[PDB]
Fold this protein.
Amino acid sequence: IQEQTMLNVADNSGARRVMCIKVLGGSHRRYAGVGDIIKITIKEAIPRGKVKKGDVLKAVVVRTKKGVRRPDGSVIRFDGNACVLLNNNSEQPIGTRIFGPVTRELRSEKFMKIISLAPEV
Amino acid sequence: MKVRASVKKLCRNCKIVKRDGVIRVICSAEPKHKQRQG
Amino acid sequence: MFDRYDAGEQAVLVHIYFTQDKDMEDLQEFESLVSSAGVEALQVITGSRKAPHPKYFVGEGKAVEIAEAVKATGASVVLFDHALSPAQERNLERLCECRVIDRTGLILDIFAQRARTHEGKLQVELAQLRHLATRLVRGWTHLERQKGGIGLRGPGETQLETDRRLLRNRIVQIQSRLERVEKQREQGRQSRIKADVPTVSLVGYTNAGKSTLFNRITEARVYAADQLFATLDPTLRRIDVADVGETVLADTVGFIRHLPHDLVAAFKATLQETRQATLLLHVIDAADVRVQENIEAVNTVLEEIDAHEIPTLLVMNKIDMLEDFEPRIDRDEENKPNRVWLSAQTGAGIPQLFQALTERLSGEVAQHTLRLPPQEGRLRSRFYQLQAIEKEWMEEDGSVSLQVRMPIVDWRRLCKQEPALIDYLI
Amino acid sequence: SRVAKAPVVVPAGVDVKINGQVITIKGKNGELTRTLNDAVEVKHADNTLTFGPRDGYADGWAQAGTARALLNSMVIGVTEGFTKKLQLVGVGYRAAVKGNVINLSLGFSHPVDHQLPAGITAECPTQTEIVLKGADKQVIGQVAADLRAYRRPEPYKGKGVRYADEVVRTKEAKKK
Amino acid sequence: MIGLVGKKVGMTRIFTEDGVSIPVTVIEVEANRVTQVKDLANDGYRAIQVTTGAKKANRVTKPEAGHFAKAGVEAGRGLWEFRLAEGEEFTVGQSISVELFADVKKVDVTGTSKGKGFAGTVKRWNFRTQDATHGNSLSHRVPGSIGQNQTPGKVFKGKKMAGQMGNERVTVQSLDVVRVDAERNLLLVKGAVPGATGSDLIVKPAVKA
RNA sequence: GUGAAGAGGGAAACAACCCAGACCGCCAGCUAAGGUCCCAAAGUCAUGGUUAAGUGGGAAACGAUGUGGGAAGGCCCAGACAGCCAGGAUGUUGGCUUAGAAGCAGCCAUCAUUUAAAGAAAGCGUAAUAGCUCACUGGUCGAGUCGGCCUGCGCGGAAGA
RNA sequence: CGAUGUCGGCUCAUCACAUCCUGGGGCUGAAGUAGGUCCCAAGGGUAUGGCUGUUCGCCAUUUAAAGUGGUACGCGAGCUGGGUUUAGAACGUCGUGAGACAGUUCGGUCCCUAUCUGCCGUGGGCGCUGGAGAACUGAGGGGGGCUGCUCCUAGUACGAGA
RNA sequence: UGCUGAAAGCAUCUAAGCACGAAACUUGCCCCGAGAUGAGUUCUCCCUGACCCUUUAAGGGUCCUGAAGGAACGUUGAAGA
Ligand SMILES: Nc1nc2c(ncn2[C@@H]2O[C@H](COP(=O)(O)OP(=O)(O)NP(=O)(O)O)[C@@H](O)[C@H]2O)c(=O)[nH]1
Ligand SMILES: [Mg+2]
């Protein structure tokens, strides 16, 4: 989340770590991100998926250090921050495969493609 | 329409009119002729 | 500072093709520049075989010579072909008296003497502006000498850097006015949204006869003469075509080698029509050996202005002089980026131009032989109403057969609006 | 001026009744007084409806002739009604009557309804048409167009309520 | 319609079956009684005064008690008002309470909010911090730029600065009722009430609904 | 010419404008420019005329059935002007164009007739053909009517910290 | 000139309306989609980053919008001291020179404890016609005002299609 | 954007007189608020003692009264420099 900030790619398709660059939506949303899509720059990569160095891309939060409220005083916290790369145009998961479990809180839209293709909530 | 400081007219059906202080004028050839605030 | 430098004065001309590698302008085409400029030509001083210098552009001795030539033959100005950096003009001035101008400011001067439409005014004076903004920069020196050298209390920013900002503000201002303009012509271009939008544009040097072909094809008033800038201002007139009937035309200004940078940047408005244009018709001269080069000249700017991705259609105009051939179709291929055999002032080559064109823009020639029984007055109606019956042949008991060829949008507006149980068209 | 001094003449069935500046106008079915008269000393006699400016007003024949035109409209009102053929056309459209509320259908999600102030009623020879009928000549047509007001008919196919017959603008630019 | 004077007794976390965990402030609603009625003849506005709570029956003063003489005496910690004329009510005190709302949906609620005493800017409002590095001498957290040079050569009266904060009346307009409870004079409302624990709240229904 | 080096009154506040050059007193009088419903000294003065805007109390080229004033000119009781009753003509759908053009795709001709009246045409319409309205006039109705010119005074143009 | 501290940033706003969006309308070369202008509108709201001392300008990605301009080019008795202009030194260059250069680079001290004003809180005195005690009414004043995006209407009106 | 409607026989959104019409306008919400020197409302509650001389909108003086209520101090506060 936020500006800069390292992110672990969640998907198989991504090539290792990348950094956030803009938070879509809002006049200019501050400390934002949990399912909201965000802009990305690849910084650290190997040939892998169709991802490449130097690119800018849309993406989604799926795992979060500050984590998520759940309706009962619940706060599901994680370690690191998983993220899934996306067309800046087509949106769409770019990934054949998610790694690591993620919350139900992200669902509907294409994300049901994600979470259905993503084991364990 | 416009607010052309000069007004004149644009057909034969055109006709100057007063409304309020303002000098309106209209046609029906095409409405676009509607001069006013001259 | 919208100020103009005059064309039409006595001039020591200096030029050097004789540089050895870039080459350029045998002189004569430059002389044409001089000509349409209306310059009072005097003499053609020329130097030798040099790479360009940090000095006075050309060599020391020759420079001294042109200096003296000025001082004696009394030229009103040292015209000096081939561009230089401002200091080069400076040091050159130290050896003279008069205004110097590179190839550029010449071209702007003549350009501006040609301005008539207000659009042309802004983009011109814009190019004038951007150009002069550079050159002014050394000129502080006098202004500085009178200034005292210390005592800038108040401002932190230095003067003339001030003036730099001034002309920046001018610049933005100019383009600012340019904005609503390109928007304007664009509002004209909303009509280009109607799906039925053939949109040609012509290209070539000045005296590529552009005015002429445009004339004969249009039966319209566009004057043409030997001079450069034989046209200015884009010019719309519609024309016939066998497969879209209406067909918008707009002449572009003619080209030269190495037309100015910032010119184009100001000129994008005028060419903004070219970009969208669905087909780059391109006339070329047939008398010059310059042929190849000019194409290479034209390609140059085409690059910088995009849309060189457009299909094109060459016309080796000026077949008169050559008796190159009878005018003909000249399928370069089935693709047709064709050469076309013209002499526009005679324009004898046209029918092949249109016909080849007729091949080159369409997308539905499945023709149909339509027919009706006494219920066709409405058919003949539609066909004359929109495009064309290809053939009208009445026949027995009011049954009447026809042939028609239209683009498909017609086919469905028709199939919809009319009952079209006549059903030959889809 | 013209009509302003033209006598109104009161028809026998109709019963004019001067009262101050205003004049009650009992009639065949109408019976009111739109009129109010700032200046002109309009007056009854045999049937004789006086006008001509009273004091000084300059509005004289203006207001006066206006008054005639009114009551003269009015008495014709107390005879009978006025504005009609308040048509609507184009596919999917329709209209209806009830009580005093009037149905209309114009592609809107919410149904189109407005209820007439009295002195006028209506009918539906078809949903395509609403005929109006009102005692007094002003309010009927005014509200009639005010009924049209919900949808000034669109140029490109004439859809939208069209007050009376009334040929309108009909351009065909930027189509297909 | 009308409100009542009850008080804060501790925010809690109520559950449904979903147990979504509605945050739930609880206001106790003690029975009231009507200190006086006013009408559009003696007073400008048809009205009902009331009270609730209790004094030490020595804590009371006679000028106070003499007002308490009429329409009986519940005693109380103070009075409260309700302007009304669409509605109608007794000179005699109510015994009514929570039932009044047992139907209702959005109570209003209004309170004093805990005093924060004198306080800094960036708290009376939300001024940003000026930077504390790269210099910023002597002013790491300071009132910003007021005034504006020559000009009308004076300083306006918007834009506060250091000053009072807290201990002040303020409504919250709309508030939903979680649950009326005839049980223990309880009354259950979502969100939270400005006003410190152990102090009263007015609670009239929705108005800006 | 005043000021500088000149005090008064007036133009709200005002060295340089209009009026007036203070030897000092006087709880006397009349005047100046300038003013006279109130602050506030005196006309709610007289009579005559205009302004409809708060012009006055910020301004132009320029626009216009603003309203005062003017000279002259046109039409008409053989009845016009406005509306209203009806006619709208035959050559000839002029020749050319062209699928079709013909009062209205054009083109150039556009006459001759009849009649009070009607153009081969002023506008609409049709693919085109054929409707639709005036120009034309009879009738109607009954006094005025249509303009240009000059001209006082007003509106429109006219947005700021 | 018996001293009025000067550019950029940084806290802070303030108005204008010559409109950046949102709001209301005229025409359109307004199918709808959308625009373009024009009118009316000042209620509120109106981009973080890269690069450079920068304002700009350029660039990357946004948002409905990245409006103008006034206000000792609002804001150094609030800060900032990077640019601006000292002495140090160097380069090119002009000078025979000492010396200079708006040609560039290195380094380089921001003072004032608030009487008055006006500002924010919060007080005490006296007033209000014997005296208190609580409850008031509203004479006036201020805060408050953005909006995306989704489905329903409905794949409808539009359009040949899209 | 209108209706009706004349002055100007027709017209005409205007002269008369009605219908509209917006983040703006004034309310509608909240807060403030009789120093609102126009100083207001309602409710409660209280004191209803004698004598003397001077000027009498006036007291002054004696004497005797002290009321509700106010505090002052102390216990302290999510109240507060
Ligand atoms: N022999 C010959 N002369 C020609 C031909 N076309 C044009 N010319 C002549 O050469 C000149 C061309 O003028 P112009 O058409 O203006 O050239 P241009 O290319 O149009 N210039 P611009 O576009 O600036 O007008 C005229 O004299 C023209 O008559 C051609 O095909 N043959
Ligand atoms: Mg040409």
Q: What stands out?
A: Helices of chain A lie at 111-116. Chains A and C do not touch (no CB pair under 8 Å). The first strand of chain A starts at residue 6 and ends at 9.
